[PDB]
């Protein structure tokens, strides 16, 4: 074939500021919180 030639945002779980979601285990990323 053609051959080539060569922001960390921290927080803590405190209500109502940061709370867990309902399906938190079934989500990933920033949508978990």
UniProtKB/Swiss-Prot annotation:
Subcellular location: Cell membrane; Postsynaptic cell membrane; Postsynaptic density membrane
Post-translational modification: Palmitoylated. Depalmitoylated upon L-glutamate stimulation.
Induction: Down-regulated in the pyramidal cell layer of CA1 in the hippocampus by global ischemia.
Tissues in which the UniProt entry reports expression: Detected in forebrain. Detected in dendrites of neuronal cells. Expressed in the pyramidal cell layers of CA1 and CA3 and in the granule cell layer of the dentate gyrus.
Family: Belongs to the glutamate-gated ion channel (TC 1.A.10.1) family. GRIA2 subfamily.
Other remarks in the entry: The postsynaptic actions of L-glutamate are mediated by a variety of receptors that are named according to their selective agonists. This receptor binds AMPA (quisqualate) > L-glutamate > kainate.
Quaternary structure (record): Homotetramer or heterotetramer of pore-forming glutamate receptor subunits. Tetramers may be formed by the dimerization of dimers. May interact with MPP4. Forms a ternary complex with GRIP1 and CSPG4. Interacts with ATAD1 in an ATP-dependent manner. ATAD1-catalyzed ATP hydrolysis disrupts binding to ATAD1 and to GRIP1 and leads to AMPAR complex disassembly. Interacts with GRIP2. Interacts with GRIP1. Interacts with NSF via its C-terminus. Interacts with CACNG2, PICK1 and GRIP2. Interacts with GRIA1 and SYNDIG1. Part of a complex containing GRIA2, NSF and NAPA and/or NAPB.
Description of its domains: The M4 transmembrane segment mediates tetramerization and is required for cell surface expression.
Described function: Ionotropic glutamate receptor that functions as a ligand-gated cation channel, gated by L-glutamate and glutamatergic agonists such as alpha-amino-3-hydroxy-5-methyl-4-isoxazolepropionic acid (AMPA), quisqualic acid, and kainic acid. L-glutamate acts as an excitatory neurotransmitter at many synapses in the central nervous system and plays an important role in fast excitatory synaptic transmission.
Protein name: Glutamate receptor 2
Source organism (scientific name): Rattus norvegicus
Upper classification of the organism: Eukaryota, Metazoa, Chordata, Craniata, Vertebrata
Region of the whole protein represented: 394 to 442 of 883
């Amino acid at each position: 074939k053609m051959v080539v030639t060569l922001v960390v945002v921290t927080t803590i779980l405190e209500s109502p500021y940061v709370m867990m979601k309902k399906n938190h285990e079934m989500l990933e990323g920033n949508e978990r919180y």
